[PDB]
Amino acid sequence: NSNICEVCNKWGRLFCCDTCPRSFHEHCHIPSVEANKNPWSCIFCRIKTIQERCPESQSGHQESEVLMRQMLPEEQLKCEFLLLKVYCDSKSCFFASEPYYNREGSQGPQKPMWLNKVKTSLNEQMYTRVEGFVQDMRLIFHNHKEFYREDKFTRLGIQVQDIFEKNFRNIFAIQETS
Ligand SMILES: [Zn+2]
Ligand SMILES: [Zn+2]
Ligand SMILES: [Zn+2]
């Protein structure tokens, strides 16, 4: 097994995957690493199993169809993995915790949003469709772009949104386009 957490790249109290060499901090894994379960399989392994059981699940899909899917267990897992892939980027620190807004010439967003809030919402099964989760994720970056206007800090939102979107297209097998 790896000697650093797959998400945050730090050592510490790590839980080891039984079916792959990845390791995790308890609350870096999503969902939080389960108490018992020997063997234990991480989210990466669980996603790979989905694809192996149903190879046709990798044929291209329309985003509009994906978004209307109900959050059954497989879609729940896929959203958890997509959230985890965003946390894997170090630039996610800027969007993890509850933001505050006091900048000359800007007004804060009407609906603030952050990664830890999405994390809790997923944990508490508050999203009924994939669209719920994706809307809150995209709102994180949209709020950031609007607030930071022409400050170059706006680019952090662009960068983390790009990681989100690339991973969304990969995990949900969105049909490739030009
Ligand atoms: Zn970690
Ligand atoms: Zn694994
Ligand atoms: Zn199948």
PDB file of all heavy atoms in Angstrom, residues 17 19-20 42 45, ligand 2:
ATOM      1  N   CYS A  17      -6.487   0.229   1.226  1.00  0.00           N
ATOM      2  CA  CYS A  17      -7.433  -0.524   0.402  1.00  0.00           C
ATOM      3  C   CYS A  17      -6.953  -1.985   0.334  1.00  0.00           C
ATOM      4  O   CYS A  17      -5.750  -2.228   0.089  1.00  0.00           O
ATOM      5  CB  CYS A  17      -7.496   0.028  -1.021  1.00  0.00           C
ATOM      6  SG  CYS A  17      -8.800  -0.747  -2.021  1.00  0.00           S
ATOM      7  N   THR A  19      -7.900  -4.033  -2.135  1.00  0.00           N
ATOM      8  CA  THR A  19      -7.891  -4.479  -3.492  1.00  0.00           C
ATOM      9  C   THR A  19      -7.088  -3.634  -4.391  1.00  0.00           C
ATOM     10  O   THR A  19      -7.066  -3.883  -5.567  1.00  0.00           O
ATOM     11  CB  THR A  19      -9.355  -4.669  -3.989  1.00  0.00           C
ATOM     12  OG1 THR A  19     -10.180  -3.513  -3.704  1.00  0.00           O
ATOM     13  CG2 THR A  19      -9.962  -5.829  -3.244  1.00  0.00           C
ATOM     14  N   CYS A  20      -6.429  -2.599  -3.870  1.00  0.00           N
ATOM     15  CA  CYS A  20      -5.523  -1.775  -4.680  1.00  0.00           C
ATOM     16  C   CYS A  20      -4.543  -1.169  -3.681  1.00  0.00           C
ATOM     17  O   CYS A  20      -4.808  -1.227  -2.515  1.00  0.00           O
ATOM     18  CB  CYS A  20      -6.242  -0.683  -5.512  1.00  0.00           C
ATOM     19  SG  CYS A  20      -6.754   0.824  -4.590  1.00  0.00           S
ATOM     20  N   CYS A  42     -11.794   0.531  -1.478  1.00  0.00           N
ATOM     21  CA  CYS A  42     -11.939   2.004  -1.660  1.00  0.00           C
ATOM     22  C   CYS A  42     -12.878   2.323  -2.831  1.00  0.00           C
ATOM     23  O   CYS A  42     -13.114   1.519  -3.743  1.00  0.00           O
ATOM     24  CB  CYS A  42     -10.518   2.638  -1.977  1.00  0.00           C
ATOM     25  SG  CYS A  42      -9.826   2.584  -3.568  1.00  0.00           S
ATOM     26  N   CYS A  45     -11.861   1.416  -6.349  1.00  0.00           N
ATOM     27  CA  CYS A  45     -12.108  -0.021  -6.652  1.00  0.00           C
ATOM     28  C   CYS A  45     -13.616  -0.269  -6.938  1.00  0.00           C
ATOM     29  O   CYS A  45     -13.962  -1.047  -7.836  1.00  0.00           O
ATOM     30  CB  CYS A  45     -11.619  -0.913  -5.484  1.00  0.00           C
ATOM     31  SG  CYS A  45      -9.803  -1.015  -5.519  1.00  0.00           S
TER      32      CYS A  45
HETATM   33 ZN    ZN B   2      -8.834   0.426  -3.900  1.00  0.00          ZN
END
